[PDB]
């Protein structure tokens, strides 16, 4: 609702200052492109953005952001690109990413190939390595795959 501000009073959250009518109105929630701005009567009319475009903060911009298209013939998505997020890539299934970047670490690395007699702590496939520590028999350990923990 177009609630009028008064001198020495701050407009509440989710309302900014709209200068076209000099009156603060409600802010559309993240996931919206303000297509009509505030007037003396008309509040901000919310409407969702298109695909592969978003806004991560309660916005009034008439244009939405842009996520990526694909990471590679490999490098599947570990996080989809919806209306409230970005296409967070990974460095292919069964490969650990040891470097870092905004999403795509410039260097990935093979998941691991450590011999029977190594126990892979945890992949940390997003930003870490599986590691390989002895567990030499463990319960049953006679496989070189290293994709699996000490199990048979």
């Amino acid at each position, epitope marked *: 609702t177009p609630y009028a501000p008064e001198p020495g009073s701050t407009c509440r959250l989710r309302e900014y200052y709209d200068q076209t009518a000099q009156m603060c109105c409600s802010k559309c929630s993240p996931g919206q492109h303000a297509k009509v701005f505030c007037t003396k009567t008309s509040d901000t009319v919310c409407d969702s953005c298109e695909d592969s475009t978003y806004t991560q903060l309660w916005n009034w911009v008439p244009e939405c952001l842009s996520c990526g298209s694909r*990471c*590679s*013939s*490999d*490098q599947v998505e570990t996080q989809a690109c919806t209306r409230e997020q970005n296409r967070i*890539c990974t*460095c*292919r299934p069964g490969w650990y990413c*040891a*470097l*870092s*970047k905004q999403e*795509g*670490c*410039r*260097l*990935c*690395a*093979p998941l691991r190939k450590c011999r029977p007699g190594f126990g892979v702590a945890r992949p940390g496939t997003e930003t870490s390595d599986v590691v390989c520590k002895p567990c030499a028999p463990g319960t049953f350990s006679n496989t070189t795959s290293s994709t699996d923990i000490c199990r048979p």
Partner: antibody, heavy 119, light 107 residues
Framework: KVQLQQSGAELVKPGASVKLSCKAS????????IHWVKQRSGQGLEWIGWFYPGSDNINYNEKFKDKATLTADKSSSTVYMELTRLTSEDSAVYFCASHEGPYVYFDYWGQGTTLTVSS | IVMTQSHKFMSTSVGDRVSITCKAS??????VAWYQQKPGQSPKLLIY???TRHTGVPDRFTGSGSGTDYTLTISSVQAEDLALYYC?????????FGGGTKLEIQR
């Protein structure tokens, strides 16, 4: 567009060490990483080490782990390598390359730095 | 990973077929590339990411692999193709390079 251009040949009394400047342009400096692989004529490419621009991570190659110096300047978009006490053996052709995407492949290459060591 | 080039000087005639046998010490899976260098010229990337041809590269060069004895092929041979040919993996932090190749016409 990882454009890589390199300086020409340099000659200095053995014992001193020079710091190179592999100037690069056409792509954001941090989002790319520039390695160091020299091309001594008659010798295959041998990788001196790699340096992270954005996160300032460094991994000097075990052959050059100490004697090399993979420094860089952020503003100039240039990696600065110094090979301590340039010797006649170290006197050679130097190259710097990089990648554009997330899994490395040297899609780009430098012009080829050159170095000569004699008196 | 010590990437090598088993061929450093081939024999071929114009418009013939030959295969390079870039060889490594450890597997790289889809982490192979392809670099060609005319003498005195900055090297160019030929094929990257297994078989994915680099942008604006002549078709005649084709090949891929997923093991340790990588191989591609060339269908048509021209005098300009005579050059230095090597590769470089993308596997672990020690990148290396093949020794090189030198296509040589047999007239």
């Amino acid at each position: 567009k990882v454009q890589l251009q390199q300086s020409g040949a340099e000659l200095v009394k053995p014992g001193a060490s020079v710091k190179l400047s592999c100037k690069a342009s056409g792509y954001t400096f941090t989002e790319s990483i520039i390695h160091w692989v020299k091309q001594r004529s008659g010798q295959g490419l041998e990788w001196i080490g790699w340096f992270y621009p954005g996160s300032d991570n460094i991994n000097y190659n075990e052959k050059f782990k100490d004697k090399a110096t993979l420094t860089a300047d952020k503003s100039s978009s240039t990696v600065y390598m110094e090979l301590t006490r340039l010797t006649s053996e170290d006197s050679a052709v130097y190259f710097c390359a990089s990648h554009e995407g997330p899994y490395v492949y040297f899609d780009y290459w430098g012009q080829g730095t050159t170095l000569t060591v004699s008196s | 990973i010590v990437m090598t080039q088993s061929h450093k000087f081939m024999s071929t005639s114009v418009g013939d077929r030959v295969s390079i046998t870039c060889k490594a010490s450890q597997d790289v899976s889809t982490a192979v590339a392809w670099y060609q260098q005319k003498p005195g010229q900055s090297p160019k990337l030929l094929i990257y990411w297994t078989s994915t041809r680099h942008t604006g590269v002549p078709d005649r060069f084709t090949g891929s692999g997923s093991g340790t004895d990588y191989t591609l092929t060339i269908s048509s041979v021209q005098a300009e193709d005579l050059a230095l040919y090597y590769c470089q993996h993308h596997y672990s932090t020690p990148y290396t390079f093949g020794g090189g190749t030198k296509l040589e016409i047999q007239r």
